[PDB]
Amino acid sequence: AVADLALIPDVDIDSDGVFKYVLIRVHSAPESKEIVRGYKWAEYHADIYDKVSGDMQKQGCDCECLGGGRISHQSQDKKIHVYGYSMAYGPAQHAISTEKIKAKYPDYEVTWA
């Protein structure tokens, strides 16, 4: 009953406009990392968390919301801005979110407020 973290992508983010995102920590069974998740289809951060923590359980992973905020993806100008907070989880450490994002989008100019 071994869960593989190398299979869960660190960043899974939409690609066009402004959307709420969350920084979540997945926990493997006795092993741990943080992941970026943000979608345009969610009115609230809890919605993203529900959906994602749900998928994680199917991979044998435990979830914890370490905060949230917003991502401004400007696919055109190759820019991704990370800022704000989530009212249900508080602010996320956007520095970590941008670390993983910039790693996935090197050609992009990533920043956080």
From Swiss-Prot:
* Taxonomic superkingdom: Eukaryota
Paired cysteines (S-S): none
Q: What is its EC number?
A: 3.9.1.3
Q: Which residues carry this modification: N-acetylalanine?
A: 1
According to its UniProt record, where is this protein located? Answer: Cytoplasm
User: Which keywords describe this protein according to UniProt?
Assistant: Acetylation, Cytoplasm, Hydrolase, Protein phosphatase
Q: Which GO terms describe its cellular component?
A: cytosol; extracellular exosome; leading edge of lamellipodium; nuclear body; nucleoplasm; plasma membrane
Family, as annotated? Belongs to the janus family.
Known partners and oligomeric status: Monomer.
- Name used for this protein in its record: 14 kDa phosphohistidine phosphatase
Q: Which organism is it from?
A: Homo sapiens
